[PDB]
Amino acid sequence: SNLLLQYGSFCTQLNRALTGIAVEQDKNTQEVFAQVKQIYKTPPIKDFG
Amino acid sequence: SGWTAGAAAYYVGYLQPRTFLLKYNENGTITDAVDCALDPLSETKCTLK
Ligand SMILES: *[C@@H]1O[C@H](CO)[C@@H](O)[C@H](O)[C@H]1NC(C)=O
């Protein structure tokens, strides 16, 4: 670990890239599924013709 | 027995191998520091530099 201490910039940029990927995944799910802001419910009756 | 002690105090602590993040100001003086791996917030401050 003491020898690795001088590669902190490399490891920081690695973890920055991975954190960006993770935030991107959360954002992707949000854009696909959370388009509608309101949670509509199905009617109790199913008279859909 | 024929003596008295003047008022003074001293404090003793022990050093450990630690990683520190030191801040050198514009005049070259260490004005502040972060003891790394004290608490998780300090680890975050280390990683973010
Ligand atoms: C640095 O030295 C100069 C003296 O020329 C002084 O004016 C200044 O306050 C010093 N900077 C700090 C942060 O103490």
Token pair for A23: 């935030």
* Other C-beta atoms lying within 10 Å of the C-beta of residue A32: 8
Residue listed under structure tokens 């509608």:
A36
Q: What is the dihedral of CA A10, A14, A17, A23, to 10 degrees?
A: -130
- Residue to mutate, B25, B27, B30, ligand 1, most ligand atoms under 8 Å from C-beta: B27
Distance CA B28, CA B31 (A): 9
Distance CA B34, CA B37 (A): 9
* Other C-beta atoms lying within 10 Å of the C-beta of residue B17: 5
Please tell me the experimental approach by which this structure was elucidated: cryo-EM
Q: How many CA atoms lie within 13 A of B34 on its CB side?
A: 15
DSSP-assigned beta bridge partners for residue B25: none
Token pair for A26: 């959360």
